[PDB]
Symmetry: D2
């Protein structure tokens, strides 16, 4: 109690009852479980991103606006169904719904567009249809590709090649859907930007009772690697027809978050279901509760010991900033990023503080939704003559956006992470600031 006594007198006894704080202060995992309280409300913003599959039930511009308000971060286009003309209309409807909020840049929410490929099917390499669908994604500016049935590192190289020179910035999330993919996992993850645990096909290729081992191992290996991991298929399946999910479904969503999944997905739930906005609201509600129940004491310590020593200033500054954020119960970590890399390196250490990422890249702002706990802000202002002043304006943009969105209150402490010179890869500074 001596390690909380002073901050208890300062922040109050009511602060330390919320967001499962008594449970996270526990010395053991058994004590942590015993200290979980249903009356302990989550205060932090929802960090696990929600991928919603776009279909007939969620294609209208007006419906898409409701899903954005409900918590949709990434829009998935399943290229197994629909024509190129159909998917181009979906992309346009999504962009129209997202840009309807651009009038207020302090409260604008970027939404990523992901292309889920049909797959190789009976074939060995990349199918002819996949090459055409990938060329479509490049021409239409998709941010992510969920490459279906990845079975080796050569499969991911084929997808990167089909994207061409212009599709270099697109993120490749390899869907592990069969036994070969599970066995060659380490070689696949090495060449991928992240992974997707495609439980539907995986539950047919391997025994249904073994899928949870594959999900847990893949999530843990992705967490170790610092790369995003998506949990997919049948998460809230009953919500396709019913307004409330089963006890197994709510348990499943919460357990995917507890395992360490960066993203959670809705397939039929939002693409063809009667309750698409309600499925997004439900995933948001469960994720918020599950994230508070994460045992950060052992999680951070294990992530820290497992991570190898590094001489990269971005990597060093990231662990220093996350450690600083935990020490003062920082409301947020504000980071300036160009490619999203600095925000990704903060994210891998799983801080309780929100990683508010300020970027000028619209693509990077959409793609950082793949990383848990990263809240992107798109800076639209033109560059100042003095670089040091341009940096200060972006930091103030992050504070004003964070104050307006409820992340920051006056009196709160924030960690600011910046670089010494412009251009990607020079992040090396950490500042402790008091919100005034």
């Amino acid at each position: 109690r001596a390690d909380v006594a002073q901050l208890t007198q300062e922040l109050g006894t009511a602060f330390f009852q919320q967001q499962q704080l008594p449970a996270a202060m526990a010395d053991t995992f058994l004590e942590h479980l015993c200290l979980l309280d249903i009356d302990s409300e989550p205060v932090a913003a929802r960090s696990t991103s929600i991928i919603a599959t776009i279909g007939p039930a969620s294609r209208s511009v007006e419906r898409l606006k409701e899903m954005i308000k409900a918590g949709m971060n990434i829009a998935r286009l399943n290229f197994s169904h629909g024509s190129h003309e159909y998917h181009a209309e979906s992309i346009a409807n999504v962009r129209e719904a997202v840009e309807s909020f651009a009038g207020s840049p302090l409260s604008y929410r970027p939404v990523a567009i992901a292309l889920d490929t049909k797959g190789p099917g009976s074939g060995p390499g990349l199918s002819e249809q996949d090459v055409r669908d990938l060329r479509f994604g490049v021409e239409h500016g998709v941010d992510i590709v969920f490459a279906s049935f990845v079975r080796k590192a050569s499969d991911v190289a084929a997808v990167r090649a089909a994207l061409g020179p212009e599709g270099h910035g697109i993120k490749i999330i390899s869907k592990i859907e069969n036994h070969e993919g599970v066995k060659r996992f380490d070689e696949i993850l090495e060449v991928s930007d992240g992974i997707m645990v495609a439980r539907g096909d995986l539950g047919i290729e391997i025994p249904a009772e073994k899928v949870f081992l594959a999900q847990k191992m893949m999530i843990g290996r992705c967490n170790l690697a610092g790369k995003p991991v998506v949990c997919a298929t049948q998460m809230l399946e009953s919500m396709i027809t019913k307004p409330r999910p089963t006890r197994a479904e709510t348990s499943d969503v919460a357990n995917a978050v507890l395992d360490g999944a960066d993203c959670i997905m809705l397939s039929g739930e939002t693409a063809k279901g009667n309750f698409p906005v309600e499925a997004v609201k439900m995933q948001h509600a469960i994720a918020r509760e599950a994230e508070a129940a994460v045992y950060h004491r052992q999680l951070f310590e294990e992530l820290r010991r497992a991570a190898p020593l590094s001489r990269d200033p971005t990597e060093v500054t990231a662990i220093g900033a996350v450690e600083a954020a935990f020490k003062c119960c920082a409301a947020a970590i504000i980071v300036l990023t160009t490619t999203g890399r600095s925000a990704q390196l903060l994210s891998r250490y799983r801080p309780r503080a929100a990683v508010i990422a300020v970027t000028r890249s619209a693509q990077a702002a959409r793609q950082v939704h793949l990383c848990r706990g990263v809240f992107p802000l798109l800076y639209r202002e033109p560059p100042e003559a003095i670089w040091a002043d341009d940096v200060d304006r972006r930091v103030q943009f992050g504070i004003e956006s964070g104050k307006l969105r409820g992340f920051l209150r006056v009196g709160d402490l924030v960690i600011v992470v910046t670089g010494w010179r412009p251009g990607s890869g020079y992040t090396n500074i950490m500042r402790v600031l008091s919100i005034s």
Copy 2:
């Protein structure tokens, strides 16, 4: 051998951290140990057939639940009889006979405050018909448990009371309820309506953890494999749910509509068996045992002291089983609370105790039917040999295996105090 250390997630359990443990989980690592989490199957039209109950017993059913919300007393007496007929059809081979507990799930107080009039009549029925367990519905305070204990009368003293926590008051008064109950049931169906649906997993995880700490059984209930009522295979969320209830530390898992009225009752039991076996191998025993050890308070009870010594000994030699003689099941329960990887093979002459130990994870009851030998230590050895022969026949033991034998210094319950290291010959 090298082959032994690749099975039952042994590389994953040897890991120094939980993150390393997760990364070392192998889908090609097959489970070796017997399924420890017991399966409760609700009895209804789909599962009352004597021939069907035999198939469910073979599939892995350990406890038969009678839902007193549906049916008359005449209906439930026919269920009890059909279950007993199916269970006793295997009594001809005592080395492979599997005891099955009968549990009475009460209707509940509903609008009322105390124990309803129907519940008092249903509880008296349970006593008259020899039920082993009671799942008392909508327990809100310790006085509710006392009312159930009182309705059971003097003859229902041996019956176990598992308090169903189905509402917010029960979740808040949990500590006082668990103190007076024999165990708990996380009744997720009503709980998911009384409290926000998105908070039920916190209540499940807290209750399971508190029960694990207390050394009392905890059942995870409702909608575990719901789609198996109509479909031959479950959803990805359903298999995940079953596995996560086992990983959380649930002693029992339950089937309601999946076995009461569904099209796949035997298939539902086989599925819960298959998932539990996988999930139990994936349990991180290194931290689990260490935390259970540290958390458990000091004790001057020889049964309690012998239990921790035996579990520690079982871990040191990778014991295939811990064979314990128990009259009331208590010795077996105290071994179980430390979550050993070794099976707790419990030999008992009490048919009621043999049925009731299914509530404790990892306890495999054996009913000894032979009459007592004149020389006590000879009778004790015959029981230990019965446990070895049963374990050999059922696949738990092989020649060359090491086994921990837990016994007492004199006849009668409460005198366990000895732990022996034995080599299977």
Copy 3:
């Protein structure tokens, strides 16, 4: 059941701490030691401690092992010392429940490349005179231990070889030396000349830790209470040194000139006794036993499995003692390696084993001289009660206390497999 006063003594609040930093902060100088002194005291016999009457005073002060330095004195001189020690020890053998055995150790002169001619003659002398231990000087490699082992003629294979690590070669070849030795001695005198004086503490701490991991005795030797040769009280560095050797994990502590030629031989023994008692209470058993537990490999030896089960059981009930029946001292040694807080009362019929177990920390030997009983189980029982009766008489046990009893299933060495939880009546 024990009281608030029990939990304030023997640094019990400090041992319950969750961290080592918290453990240090909870050390109380007002917390008095209750347990008996476990770290054994080796006293060098010389002109200052050779008389039968002086030896009786040193036995009463706490001397467990008598060291004969073969660097000084003739074979006739050392034979008279052996006879005087045996006469002083047997003067108390009329009251067998309270009789204390004392080991005799021969410290060799030293090598030259191989075993010297004088060492071969001195080792033959040790065998002919029934010495229990040999402190082999300047061991540099495993071949040196084999030469001493070979020199312990045909009769002396039972003698324990404690390898003195006195130079850089011994420190580097440590693993191969410890593998073939019965234990080690950190001979700091010569080691402080062969290697930089400021590096000796690293060698001491590494060697003690490796011996603790191996389960073999480790002696801390030279200049522990050097000022007590001339002065009646030691320096602040000397008391700190003795306490830190105990805290590091040393099984034995030694007095060279302090006892052999000094002015205060009985006072140096009393001082080492006083400091060791304090230091043992301050040991952080929570992390010590958990690390010893994890570091020790899995074993399929019933003696090794029973030992960890018994120490775990002893800790759970705060057992006053662990009574182990041993013939070679092995079972007591395996209990000792897990560093229990309970005294290991070892009952043996071997006078040599009774003397040699003083090398193991926390082992209190009892030589049992009684005529054997016709029924082996009754003979087992008489020795267990002999251990309790002696324990009661010496202050280790009271009626109501809990004890752990380790025995085997059949007579003869190497069959230890039972652990019983007994209440002292």
Copy 4:
């Protein structure tokens, strides 16, 4: 080759038992000696030429025992020490500051004695940096010493000597009002049983480490070196164990004040401390210090833990911190980093007083303030790099953590930077 030195295999161990087993006598210490050495000044160590040798041997703090000698005697000692220290001021990149500490006579049979009030006023008039207040029994005793220093003796550090049973029992109230503690084992070994002193030492060191306040281990550390050129096996063990316990400072009383080998006793304490610091199990030490330290909303406190964590991640050669009062360097020190805390200060008093904190290497900056504050900071950081390069702490290619503030004055430390040397 880097990973075989400074007990790096032993520090990477998953358990403390494995850590002990991995200690290598052939693993040489590379880092600079962090535990500061206090040397008592007497007849054997009073000459200006003798003092210069002790400064070169490793003396960081000079103790004046006011139990022996007159005010005129001690003023001559102060002057001789200052003359010996300032003889090296010609090269500011290699100049070593030396603190002057006044050890009071004590209350004896008696509150604060009349002689102590006179000796404390002497210390103020002569600019002493530290006071070792003898026989502190309660918090009111510390308040009496603070009062006897007056309005001129505000910046003086008070190290309370715990020498009796009452002081050990009232420890928490004494430490709360003191700047640090001294485990005065000589009198403590007479007031309490000799066999219980190690419990008091270990508890006090641990409580000081938890509090983030300096702790000195004192008396009979190398006692045999008063007459002999080499210490006993118990003495080398004792010095090493005081460092291993977590003592910020180690002391030499008769060993330097009246002993035949004063320079040799300083060299011996330096040699043992260097070895003992490498053998510190940082894995569990840092983790326990981190968990035990309470949450803080002070940016200096938050930046300190962030910087130490960053230093461990890259195996930083040093942490360079810009400090006015020594507080920022003290907060880095409490987390026991393996990287040297190179503290750049303009205060000469602060530079002398940071020797009380383990691992802090003070540098006195003697250049005038620049017009642009941004450039004045960069010059002090470069002074720290050049001093560190010259003194062997840094090489080109090494990584350093730089800790600065956002605005001048004390208490505004809030920035951490990862820098690559040259």
